[PDB]
Amino acid sequence: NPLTHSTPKNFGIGQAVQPKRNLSRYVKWPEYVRVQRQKKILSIRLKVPPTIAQFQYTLDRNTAAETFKLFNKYRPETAAEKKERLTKEAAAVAEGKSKQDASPKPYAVKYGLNHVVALIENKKAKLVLIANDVDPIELVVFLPALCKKMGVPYAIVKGKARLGTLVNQKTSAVAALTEVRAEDEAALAKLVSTIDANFADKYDEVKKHWGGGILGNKAQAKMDKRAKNS
Amino acid sequence: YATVSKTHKTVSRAYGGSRCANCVKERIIRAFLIEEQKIVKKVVKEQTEAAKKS
Amino acid sequence: GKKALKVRTSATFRLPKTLKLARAPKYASKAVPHYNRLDSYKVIEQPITSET
Amino acid sequence: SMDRDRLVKALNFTNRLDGKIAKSISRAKYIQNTRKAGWDSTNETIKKELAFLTNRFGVLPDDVE
Amino acid sequence: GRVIRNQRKGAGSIFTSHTRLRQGAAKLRTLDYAERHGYIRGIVKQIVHDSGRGAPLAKVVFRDPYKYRLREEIFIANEGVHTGQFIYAGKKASLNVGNVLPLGSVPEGTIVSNVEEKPGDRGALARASGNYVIIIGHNPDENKTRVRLPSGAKKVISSDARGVIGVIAGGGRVDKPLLKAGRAFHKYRLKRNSWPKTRGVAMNPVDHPHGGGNHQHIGKASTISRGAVSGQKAGLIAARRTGLLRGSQKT
RNA sequence: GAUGGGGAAGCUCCGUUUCAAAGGCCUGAUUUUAUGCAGGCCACCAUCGAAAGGGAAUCCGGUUAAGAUUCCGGAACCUGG
RNA sequence: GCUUGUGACGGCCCGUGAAAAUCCACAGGAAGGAAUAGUUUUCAUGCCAGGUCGUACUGAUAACCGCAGCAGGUCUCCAAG
RNA sequence: UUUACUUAUUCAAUGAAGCGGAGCUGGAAUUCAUUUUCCACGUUCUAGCAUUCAAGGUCCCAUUCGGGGCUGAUCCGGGUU
Ligand SMILES: [Mg+2]
Ligand SMILES: [Mg+2]
Ligand SMILES: [Mg+2]
Ligand SMILES: [Mg+2]
Ligand SMILES: [Mg+2]
Ligand SMILES: [Mg+2]
Ligand SMILES: [Mg+2]
Ligand SMILES: [Mg+2]
Ligand SMILES: [Mg+2]
Ligand SMILES: [Mg+2]
Ligand SMILES: [Mg+2]
Ligand SMILES: [Mg+2]
Ligand SMILES: [Mg+2]
Ligand SMILES: [Mg+2]
Ligand SMILES: [Mg+2]
Ligand SMILES: [Mg+2]
Ligand SMILES: [Mg+2]
Ligand SMILES: [Mg+2]
Ligand SMILES: [Mg+2]
Ligand SMILES: [Mg+2]
Ligand SMILES: [Mg+2]
Ligand SMILES: [Mg+2]
Ligand SMILES: [Mg+2]
Ligand SMILES: [Mg+2]
């Protein structure tokens, strides 16, 4: 004990060599990281028109969880199941000679963009889910107005990757329910009530507001001090 | 200088083959007197502060 | 919580170090290796027989 | 602001011209009266310019251990 | 004609600067946290001669504040500094000859040299021997300081630009005559290939606008326009006056 | 004078550390046991450019038709292991 | 005495008269360590190895260039009475 | 014409190191009812020294010659200035 002696350092401004600190605020990142961050910044700095700014009003967490539970109840057929269905129905039609008889009517979600855009305008679709992050946004900027004109419930949901995991792809960017079996019609009606309360009834008000004028921290503090001086 | 023993390149003193012994004793006296002036500074700063405390 | 915010004492970003595989071909490069291009009979040719 | 460029350039040229005239007057005044003075005056002015051109440690205690 | 000599000087083949014996570029220390908020102390180790330059140079060594290391800077020597002297640099430095201060920290009438034009370019104004800048006023709002330059002109600088207190050593250098073509030779030998100079009136019309004719003359006036086209600009370039600036020939 | 970049219809031009994710030492730990990470580094950016500049270390005697500070005889020194 | 090497000085400059590889030393105190031992190959002795290319002769009133075995031209060291 | 805004465009530097806002602790202040305010926020007789995740102070340890945390060194925003 008494052979050890305390000797506090003077990290000063001209006294000792500075210690190692967390300099993660001043890292010279690679150019791809810099372009990602500045692309997001420049997208939020500018004035955004209402037809693109109707996105980033996504669905809430509990409603998203209940919606994905309902849609996970109707997952499409996978490859091994398809192959063994082909084996079993081939064996059955080898003996009895009947097509579309051993296999019943299948229920699944619909997921391609051309297919779903054609299920609207025929008004067979009962729910449409649209991803909020399609990288060319021109593929989906017309789907709210189309669903509104054709009278289909739609919801803008977070994750083309989440829709892809729902439908056994990597990304899918749309999803649709056309028919429910027998026992999920009540849950589907409650869900489309909660969905139409959030998306389709607010359309004629959302289509008139621009949105996006947000400053950074230093400019916001400067404007606050200037208005407090004012 | 790589082909000889260390006795040919060194003098038995601190900073032996590097400084002068005049430059060495000047460094010693400077170090001792500067540290004593720092002690004097701390003492007189304490005296000013304990005077201004009242 | 947020995700993962590493602490960086350096302002420099270097390229990270990834696993370099070794080469493992599907066919041989030459398929017959050469013999000794300089053996003893190729090295020593003949004696020199003059006065010196 | 269409006058500010021409007025700043005009003021800057007048200030530069005053400085030029001042330094020219000073250098001519140096060169004359020096090139126009004989060896007698030269040697005299050279000779003239060659002529006229609490121990603190006390506040420290002693016999300290 | 052919390409004339002042046109030829811009390709930079035999007209580049002779930089072998030069000690390094002379500039101030890089602005950082210590100079921005407090001060830092270095020591001048040697005062040396620089080839092709009238003013001497000073080697001031400082410490690295983030690494155990020493850093040596090349200053231009102000008149009065000596080896073994401490140099203080930063916002809270004292008003002594040799110290580096911002222009917002000096009072009126102060004599500074090696002054930054923008804050952080490490020295632009009054760098030749015997020259200085005079502070002639401030502006606490708008953060500006008014200065007088060695040519007589007035300028307005940001108050965050730095400068060294004093006048630059080596004054009175041009008060001595050279007397000799060999002295002029050895002077320009360590600067650049620009001496001796042939007069343009002594050439042929292929070589210069002033060449040709019996009885060596310039045929027209020697004042050129500002919008001439770079083979024509030989003479007095955009002159607002001619004459003597003295008006008397004798003082 | 390449590369990274940027010009030019193009042959090619600029530039030499640049507005680039630009590369090594080893301690590891040592025991699929051999060497993946090592846990600390890493500021410099290729390369070419002097048989008069810089530069590790050799002398004497003999010897041939013609070679020698190189061969032979004797006596040294330097680098690496 | 002559030629040459070297030392300590002195004069001159608005002229103050290269760089890098490379080698050594110092500060520092990491780490290992003496008792049956660790450090030393910076003390002495002993052992092994040192690759590639050039190397003859002229260097000029005949070996180089001027159409030539051309009174021309073409860098340097030694230096007896 | 004048004047604002910053994200386009433009300029400059760096080792992309300490930016912006809010604090603590003093001081002046000086309360017109209080912190509406503002300055300060470890180094200046001397050609010394300043480097090993930092000593100390608390906690867990797997306590082995030890190994990890906080604090020492105020929070927040990831806009390098
Ligand atoms: Mg000795
Ligand atoms: Mg050059
Ligand atoms: Mg002349
Ligand atoms: Mg003529
Ligand atoms: Mg003629
Ligand atoms: Mg002409
Ligand atoms: Mg003429
Ligand atoms: Mg006439
Ligand atoms: Mg090139
Ligand atoms: Mg080479
Ligand atoms: Mg050589
Ligand atoms: Mg040399
Ligand atoms: Mg011979
Ligand atoms: Mg031999
Ligand atoms: Mg000689
Ligand atoms: Mg030595
Ligand atoms: Mg030979
Ligand atoms: Mg020979
Ligand atoms: Mg010969
Ligand atoms: Mg000869
Ligand atoms: Mg001869
Ligand atoms: Mg001849
Ligand atoms: Mg011939
Ligand atoms: Mg001849």
Short mmCIF file of N, CA and C (backbone and C1' of nucleotides) in Angstrom, two decimals, chain E residues 33 36-39 41 43-45 63-64 66-69 83-84 86 88 92-94 99, chain H residues 11-15 17-20 39-51 81:
data_model
loop_
_atom_site.label_atom_id
_atom_site.label_comp_id
_atom_site.label_asym_id
_atom_site.label_seq_id
_atom_site.Cartn_x
_atom_site.Cartn_y
_atom_site.Cartn_z
N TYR E 33 -6.47 23.63 -32.04
CA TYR E 33 -7.18 23.86 -30.79
C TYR E 33 -6.38 24.73 -29.83
N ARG E 36 -6.20 28.20 -31.06
CA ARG E 36 -7.55 28.74 -31.16
C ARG E 36 -8.10 29.13 -29.80
N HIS E 37 -7.69 28.44 -28.73
CA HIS E 37 -8.23 28.67 -27.40
C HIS E 37 -7.23 29.24 -26.40
N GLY E 38 -5.98 28.79 -26.41
CA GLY E 38 -4.99 29.25 -25.46
C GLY E 38 -3.70 29.70 -26.11
N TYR E 39 -2.57 29.14 -25.68
CA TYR E 39 -1.30 29.40 -26.36
C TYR E 39 -0.41 28.17 -26.23
N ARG E 41 4.06 27.14 -26.46
CA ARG E 41 5.41 27.68 -26.38
C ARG E 41 6.37 26.82 -27.19
N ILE E 43 10.64 27.08 -28.98
CA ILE E 43 11.95 27.68 -28.76
C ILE E 43 12.68 27.81 -30.10
N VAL E 44 13.31 28.96 -30.32
CA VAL E 44 14.06 29.17 -31.56
C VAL E 44 15.48 28.65 -31.40
N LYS E 45 15.86 27.70 -32.26
CA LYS E 45 17.12 26.98 -32.18
C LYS E 45 18.22 27.59 -33.03
N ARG E 63 6.14 21.39 -29.56
CA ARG E 63 5.78 20.03 -29.20
C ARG E 63 4.49 19.62 -29.90
N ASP E 64 4.38 18.33 -30.20
CA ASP E 64 3.14 17.74 -30.69
C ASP E 64 2.21 17.49 -29.51
N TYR E 66 -0.64 15.75 -29.42
CA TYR E 66 -1.34 14.47 -29.44
C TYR E 66 -0.40 13.28 -29.48
N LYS E 67 0.89 13.49 -29.69
CA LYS E 67 1.86 12.42 -29.79
C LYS E 67 3.15 12.89 -29.14
N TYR E 68 3.88 11.95 -28.54
CA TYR E 68 5.19 12.25 -27.98
C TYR E 68 6.18 12.45 -29.11
N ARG E 69 6.37 13.70 -29.53
CA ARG E 69 7.08 14.02 -30.77
C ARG E 69 7.38 15.51 -30.73
N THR E 83 18.72 33.29 -30.54
CA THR E 83 18.64 31.88 -30.21
C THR E 83 18.48 31.69 -28.71
N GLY E 84 17.76 30.65 -28.33
CA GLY E 84 17.43 30.42 -26.95
C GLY E 84 16.21 31.15 -26.46
N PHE E 86 12.08 31.97 -26.20
CA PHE E 86 10.77 31.33 -26.22
C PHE E 86 9.80 32.14 -27.07
N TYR E 88 5.77 32.39 -28.08
CA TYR E 88 4.43 32.03 -27.65
C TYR E 88 3.46 32.30 -28.78
N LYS E 92 -4.10 33.66 -26.30
CA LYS E 92 -3.76 34.26 -25.02
C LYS E 92 -2.28 34.60 -24.89
N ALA E 93 -1.57 34.73 -26.00
CA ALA E 93 -0.18 35.13 -25.94
C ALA E 93 -0.06 36.62 -25.60
N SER E 94 1.09 36.99 -25.05
CA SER E 94 1.36 38.36 -24.62
C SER E 94 1.94 39.19 -25.76
N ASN E 99 6.07 37.11 -30.87
CA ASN E 99 4.91 36.30 -30.57
C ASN E 99 3.90 36.35 -31.71
P C H 11 -13.53 25.29 -57.36
"O5'" C H 11 -12.91 26.07 -56.12
"C5'" C H 11 -12.44 27.40 -56.28
"C4'" C H 11 -12.14 28.06 -54.95
"C3'" C H 11 -11.16 27.34 -54.04
"O3'" C H 11 -9.81 27.50 -54.45
"C1'" C H 11 -12.99 28.15 -52.78
P A H 12 -8.74 26.35 -54.13
"O5'" A H 12 -8.57 26.37 -52.54
"C5'" A H 12 -7.88 27.42 -51.89
"C4'" A H 12 -7.89 27.25 -50.39
"C3'" A H 12 -7.31 25.96 -49.85
"O3'" A H 12 -5.90 25.97 -49.78
"C1'" A H 12 -9.34 26.46 -48.74
P A H 13 -5.08 24.60 -49.89
"O5'" A H 13 -5.18 23.96 -48.44
"C5'" A H 13 -4.61 24.62 -47.32
"C4'" A H 13 -5.14 24.10 -46.01
"C3'" A H 13 -4.89 22.63 -45.71
"O3'" A H 13 -3.58 22.41 -45.22
"C1'" A H 13 -7.12 23.20 -45.16
P U H 14 -2.86 20.99 -45.43
"O5'" U H 14 -3.47 20.07 -44.28
"C5'" U H 14 -3.27 20.37 -42.91
"C4'" U H 14 -4.22 19.59 -42.04
"C3'" U H 14 -4.15 18.07 -42.18
"O3'" U H 14 -3.09 17.50 -41.44
"C1'" U H 14 -6.41 18.78 -42.22
P G H 15 -1.93 16.68 -42.20
"O5'" G H 15 -1.93 15.26 -41.48
"C5'" G H 15 -2.36 14.09 -42.16
"C4'" G H 15 -2.99 13.10 -41.21
"C3'" G H 15 -4.50 13.27 -41.03
"O3'" G H 15 -5.13 12.01 -40.83
"C1'" G H 15 -3.39 13.68 -38.96
P A H 17 -8.38 16.14 -37.93
"O5'" A H 17 -9.11 15.54 -36.65
"C5'" A H 17 -10.35 16.06 -36.18
"C4'" A H 17 -10.23 16.73 -34.82
"C3'" A H 17 -9.21 17.86 -34.71
"O3'" A H 17 -9.74 18.86 -33.85
"C1'" A H 17 -8.85 16.30 -33.01
P G H 18 -10.35 20.21 -34.46
"O5'" G H 18 -11.46 20.62 -33.39
"C5'" G H 18 -12.63 19.85 -33.22
"C4'" G H 18 -12.94 19.60 -31.77
"C3'" G H 18 -12.80 20.78 -30.83
"O3'" G H 18 -13.93 21.63 -30.86
"C1'" G H 18 -11.85 18.83 -29.85
P C H 19 -13.78 23.22 -30.68
"O5'" C H 19 -14.95 23.83 -31.56
"C5'" C H 19 -14.84 23.92 -32.97
"C4'" C H 19 -16.14 23.62 -33.65
"C3'" C H 19 -17.41 24.10 -32.96
"O3'" C H 19 -17.67 25.47 -33.21
"C1'" C H 19 -17.70 21.87 -33.72
P G H 20 -18.47 26.38 -32.15
"O5'" G H 20 -19.95 25.79 -32.12
"C5'" G H 20 -20.90 26.15 -33.11
"C4'" G H 20 -22.20 25.42 -32.91
"C3'" G H 20 -22.88 25.63 -31.57
"O3'" G H 20 -23.62 26.83 -31.50
"C1'" G H 20 -22.86 23.33 -32.09
P C H 39 -19.24 36.99 -23.17
"O5'" C H 39 -18.01 37.86 -22.66
"C5'" C H 39 -16.72 37.29 -22.55
"C4'" C H 39 -16.05 37.64 -21.25
"C3'" C H 39 -15.14 36.57 -20.69
"O3'" C H 39 -13.88 36.50 -21.34
"C1'" C H 39 -16.52 37.35 -18.96
P A H 40 -13.39 35.09 -21.93
"O5'" A H 40 -13.06 34.23 -20.63
"C5'" A H 40 -12.04 34.64 -19.75
"C4'" A H 40 -11.97 33.78 -18.51
"C3'" A H 40 -11.89 32.28 -18.72
"O3'" A H 40 -10.61 31.82 -19.12
"C1'" A H 40 -13.42 32.75 -17.00
P C H 41 -10.49 30.65 -20.22
"O5'" C H 41 -11.12 29.36 -19.51
"C5'" C H 41 -10.52 28.77 -18.37
"C4'" C H 41 -11.51 27.93 -17.59
"C3'" C H 41 -11.79 26.53 -18.11
"O3'" C H 41 -10.86 25.58 -17.60
"C1'" C H 41 -13.83 27.63 -17.54
P G H 42 -9.42 25.33 -18.26
"O5'" G H 42 -8.41 25.99 -17.23
"C5'" G H 42 -7.00 25.92 -17.43
"C4'" G H 42 -6.24 25.89 -16.13
"C3'" G H 42 -4.71 25.91 -16.28
"O3'" G H 42 -4.13 26.63 -15.20
"C1'" G H 42 -5.37 23.95 -15.13
P U H 43 -2.96 27.70 -15.48
"O5'" U H 43 -1.75 26.84 -16.04
"C5'" U H 43 -0.42 27.08 -15.59
"C4'" U H 43 0.62 26.63 -16.59
"C3'" U H 43 1.39 27.73 -17.30
"O3'" U H 43 2.42 28.28 -16.50
"C1'" U H 43 0.74 26.10 -18.87
P U H 44 2.36 29.82 -16.04
"O5'" U H 44 3.04 30.62 -17.24
"C5'" U H 44 4.31 30.23 -17.76
"C4'" U H 44 5.24 31.41 -17.93
"C3'" U H 44 4.98 32.63 -17.04
"O3'" U H 44 6.22 33.19 -16.65
"C1'" U H 44 5.01 33.30 -19.29
P C H 45 6.79 32.97 -15.17
"O5'" C H 45 8.15 33.80 -15.16
"C5'" C H 45 9.28 33.34 -15.89
"C4'" C H 45 10.31 34.42 -16.06
"C3'" C H 45 11.60 34.01 -16.76
"O3'" C H 45 11.48 34.01 -18.17
"C1'" C H 45 12.08 35.34 -14.84
P U H 46 11.68 32.66 -19.01
"O5'" U H 46 13.10 32.10 -18.54
"C5'" U H 46 14.30 32.70 -19.00
"C4'" U H 46 15.51 31.87 -18.64
"C3'" U H 46 15.58 30.48 -19.27
"O3'" U H 46 16.94 30.18 -19.61
"C1'" U H 46 15.78 30.29 -16.94
P A H 47 17.52 30.52 -21.06
"O5'" A H 47 17.45 29.14 -21.85
"C5'" A H 47 16.20 28.63 -22.32
"C4'" A H 47 16.36 27.45 -23.24
"C3'" A H 47 17.06 26.22 -22.66
"O3'" A H 47 16.47 25.04 -23.22
"C1'" A H 47 18.21 26.95 -24.58
P G H 48 15.30 24.26 -22.45
"O5'" G H 48 16.06 23.37 -21.37
"C5'" G H 48 16.79 22.23 -21.78
"C4'" G H 48 16.91 21.21 -20.68
"C3'" G H 48 15.93 20.05 -20.71
"O3'" G H 48 16.25 19.05 -21.66
"C1'" G H 48 16.09 20.88 -18.51
P C H 49 15.09 18.35 -22.51
"O5'" C H 49 14.22 17.57 -21.43
"C5'" C H 49 14.70 16.39 -20.81
"C4'" C H 49 13.69 15.85 -19.83
"C3'" C H 49 12.36 15.44 -20.44
"O3'" C H 49 12.39 14.12 -20.94
"C1'" C H 49 11.99 16.80 -18.54
P A H 50 11.51 13.70 -22.20
"O5'" A H 50 10.02 13.76 -21.67
"C5'" A H 50 9.54 12.80 -20.74
"C4'" A H 50 8.23 13.23 -20.11
"C3'" A H 50 7.00 13.00 -20.98
"O3'" A H 50 5.89 12.66 -20.14
"C1'" A H 50 7.18 15.29 -20.45
P U H 51 5.48 11.12 -19.92
"O5'" U H 51 5.44 10.52 -21.39
"C5'" U H 51 4.23 10.46 -22.13
"C4'" U H 51 4.29 9.38 -23.18
"C3'" U H 51 4.43 7.96 -22.66
"O3'" U H 51 3.19 7.39 -22.29
"C1'" U H 51 5.94 8.34 -24.45
P U H 81 -17.87 19.88 -38.18
"O5'" U H 81 -16.87 21.09 -38.39
"C5'" U H 81 -15.75 21.28 -37.53
"C4'" U H 81 -14.79 22.28 -38.11
"C3'" U H 81 -15.42 23.51 -38.71
"O3'" U H 81 -15.80 24.44 -37.71
"C1'" U H 81 -13.71 22.70 -40.14
#
